[PDB]
Structure formats: C-alpha cells, structure tokens
Amino acid sequence: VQLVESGGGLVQAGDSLTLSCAASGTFSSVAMGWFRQAPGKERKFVANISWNGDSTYYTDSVKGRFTISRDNAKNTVYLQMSSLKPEDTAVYYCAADVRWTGDGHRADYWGQGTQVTVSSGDIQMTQSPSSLSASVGDRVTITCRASQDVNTAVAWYQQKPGKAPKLLIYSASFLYSGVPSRFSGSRSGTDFTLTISSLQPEDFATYYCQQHYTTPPTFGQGTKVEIKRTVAAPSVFIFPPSDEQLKSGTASVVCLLNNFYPREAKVQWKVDNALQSGNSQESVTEQDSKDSTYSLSSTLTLSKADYEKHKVYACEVTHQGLSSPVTKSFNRGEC
Amino acid sequence: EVQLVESGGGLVQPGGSLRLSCAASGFNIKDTYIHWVRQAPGKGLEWVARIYPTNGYTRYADSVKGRFTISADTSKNTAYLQMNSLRAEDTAVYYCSRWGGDGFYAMDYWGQGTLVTVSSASTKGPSVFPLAPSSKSTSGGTAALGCLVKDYFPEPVTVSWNSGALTSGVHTFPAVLQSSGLYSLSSVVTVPSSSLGTQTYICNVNHKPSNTKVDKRVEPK
C-alpha cells in the first residue's frame, strides 16, 4: 500500500490549488485525510473524509476555504484549497485510516508530501431497537433518528456493565483510535446508523447515539446488544452458612449456578424434601465479554434457630442445557 | 495520556448538598468544555451541565437548573458539580467527560463514575462471611468459592480477589434489596481443584460510603 500526492505548486495569496492523492495497494472502507507540515515544526492535521463521504471535518484555520472530496472508484482523495493565505505554506501529506486520538490525529498509511508555497507578493434522538440479540459474526444495525437536522454532530458510544461510556464513532461516520473496523457509522439527513458487521462476544453492551448540535446534547434510548451462544448448562454449587453468620441470628444458604446459556434457569429450594417459597432472593450477572454466559445466585435466608430445626438443605436447578434437573445438597452437621 | 478522575459521591440526605470533584491529568481544562452526564440505575444517559473553564461560561439541563452548579478551578485543573435541593430523581451515577477534537467535538475521555444516593436512611458497613469451598462446591476439577456481603447501605460495594491478582472466573453479582431495606450481594470465583489448600483465597470488600474495607479469608470446609 502506497499513497502518492500530486498537484502542489507556487501560488500567490488568495489563489486556489487542488491536491490529488492516488492510493494504490482497498481504501473505500477507511477514513482518508490530509495533514500539513512546515519544516522544523511538528506535522499537523488539515481535513478528514469518512469512508463513504457522509461526513468531513476541517481544522479551524482552513474551514470554509478547504474541501475534502473522495473517489472510491478512482482510488483518490482530493483537497480543493481556496483563498490561500501565506500561513498555508507547508508540505501537504495525504493519509489513510486517519482517526482522532485525544492528542491529535493518527494514520495507518502516509504519503510522501507535495510542497505548497503561498507567496505574499429541544432535539430528540430516537433510537431503534431498544433490545437486540444476535449470533457471533452476524451484522447488526442500530438506527437512530434526529428530530431536526443535526448535520453530522453525532457520536456513537458503547457502554459495558460497571464501566463508563466509551467513544466508538465521531462526526456520524468517523472511527475513534482503537475501535475495531467491524463498527461503521452512516448519515442520511436525520437518520444515523451504526453497523457492527462481525458481532463478537465482547460487543455485549448498550450503545447510545448522541447529538451535540445544540444545547442540550441529547442521548438515545440506548440498545442493549445480547450475544447469542450455544446452549450451555450451569455448573451448580452449594454453599452452607459460615459459623460466623450462625453466631448472629441468621443463616444464608447460597446456591451458585455458574456460567450458563440462555439466561432462563429455574431454582427451587427444598429443606428436608419440603419445597420453600418467599424465603430466597435471586441475582443474575450480566453476560460475559469473553464467553457470552450468565451466572445466578439464589440465597435462602433463614433464622439461626430454623437452620438448627432441619437436616437436608437442597438446591434444585432446571435448564435447557440439561436433560434432567440438577440437585445439590448437604446435611447440617456432617463434615 | 488524558485522564479524568472523580471524587465525592455517596449518600446525601434529601434537600441536602454534595459537591463532586473531577480531576484532570494529561491536558488543560482551559482548552476544552468539561461536562457532567448522569445515569439513573438501569436507565439511559442524561447530560447534566457543562463549563468552558477559560471564561467560566456554564450551561445546564432544565432538570438541574437553579439547583446544581458546575464550576472549575484551572489552578488545580479540576471541574466541580455542586448539587443542592436534592430530590430522589437525582439518584444516579455521575460521570464527567470532556469535549475533545480538531474541527469537531466528541466526549473522547470520561470519568470512572461516582454513584450518588439521595436518601434519608443511614449508612451501614457490610458483614462479610466466606462462601467456603466444599466437595459439594466441586465438579470435575473446578472448585467454586466466594464471599457473602450482607447488610450494607447505600450502594456500592466493590469486591476484588487476592488484591486484584485473581480476576479470572470472578463474578461479583448485582446487589439484592432485602426486606430490611439493606443491600446484600455475593462475589464468587472458580479456581482449579489443585489450587485449594496450596493457594490462599481472600476477597477484598470496600464500602466507600461508610469507609469500610474488609479482607475476609476463604478457607475450605
């Protein structure tokens, strides 16, 4: 892969130059951009064009004067420069897979440069669907409609359990630095789509679109994406009360149902073959970022005294991954 | 590298006041807009407020207008959210984020979050008991063990294993609300059968709202 720039020249102030960049290696799936550099000074970003051309963005100093175009059929990215000031005198570089970093821009591929000398003499984002569930390597789409035009002031954020929202897509179709290439953004007026092409067990999250076109910046309903896996039975374990808990007036008896799929499991407590009701509490974990499984804890909370009344303390589990119900138990007083 | 760290969440009496801090490292707050964004439990994202630390120009969501005040201190490179006239609809995890970009804005960097509970009720440190590994908690070379974190208020408690050396096969369950009105949660870990007896297992419970830090050691039956 090589990017070759062509079109640089000597120009007087207020003239207009077009720079072409021939990309040979494909380029139609990645963001193309232009950087510029004055010798002795660090390389600085100029403009960017998203893979499909939906959106562009320009460094403040060139906005209104420069225009970034792109031909996916001709393998070219252009920069139409206008009303050129002498401060635009630099080496113009063309780059491939140009992404914001938090400190500046980065790129995968770079051109060799072409010298350019300028000689002085309330909005709502309606997200769809709210819930989504698909198998690994399936293409998923989250469509989010703005109430009025917001242009390309739209960002896509993924949020996983426990943690803070993470930036995936910016300016409707641009990928942030780090984000895998399976996520693509698209704009069509007020309609903004996010596409995860090859869904992965680590794409389990809630995704939100957000408009910062006006105050207030507003978020969408979100989309909880569930990753489907193969039917997997739970590993059932039984945990009696500690002696520490028994010194007080209570006894909690936890039944662990580790790593199962789908989430629907049934748990029944039995105390001396006597089925229990309204004395147990459930909690299910959030699906795994690695193996797409769920886990569940049914706690049977009784008094110190009642625990001393009965013998056997059984937990009975029912699931898709099982041909028959799993019972795990213990007798109080036995080692 | 840019980093936003938050401090000052927790329990606050209704009507009362709580000031959240957002410490920034790896950039100047004078260059960008700093925001506060919240999330009600199991709900979506709500933009709260914003500041341009240079001139101090703020903007709020009608929902927090007249009640909350966003302010910054450049000398310290910290932004703040002073919450007053606290209602129950304000119970949420509060994130701060900035707007970074070149010829665009996007919340590239965020804070870690801090849960604010608006309640009249009183703080209570948890009671940690081991969920000791047994032969009735073993299945084909994989032994399960855990920790019970009963009777604490408000949320949250954070469980780590062996000071964070043990992360694989850990499952710290969401908390359950009891009849008492206090929370209780378990945290389990599945370790190989060969490791029990030869390797030490400790769960590190931290209830920040009542400054509780308990390191219960889980030994077999």
Numbering used by the authors:
A (entry chain L): 2 to 26, 28 to 123, 155 to 368
B (entry chain H): 1 to 221
Text of the article:
The structure of the complex formed between the antigen-binding fragment (Fab) of trastuzumab and the nanobody was solved during the course of the project, which also enabled us to confirm the ability of HDX-MS to accurately identify a binding site. The model shows a single T-dAb Fab fusion in the asymmetric unit. Examination of the interface reveals the main dAb:T Fab interactions are located in CDR L2 and CDR H3 on trastuzumab and CDR1 and CDR3 in the dAb. CDR H1, CDR H2, CDR L1 and CDR L3 of trastuzumab are not involved in the interaction. The co-ordinates were used to calculate the buried surface area of the trastuzumab-dAb interface using PISA,41 which was 405.8 Å2 and the complex (without the linker) was predicted to be stable in solution. In this case, dAb has a very slow dissociation rate (koff = (5.76 ± 0.08) x 10−5 s−1, Figure 2e), and therefore it comes off very rarely (half-life of dissociation is 3.3 hours), which does not provide many opportunities for HER2 to bind, especially over the time course of the incubation with SK-BR-3 cells. For T-dAb, cleavage of the linker between the antibody and the mask by TEV protease did not result in the activation of the antibody.
In the past decade, strategies have emerged to improve the selectivity of therapeutic antibodies at the tissue level, by masking the paratope of antibodies, allowing them to be injected as a pro-drug (i.e., in an inactive form) that gets unmasked when they are in the target region.
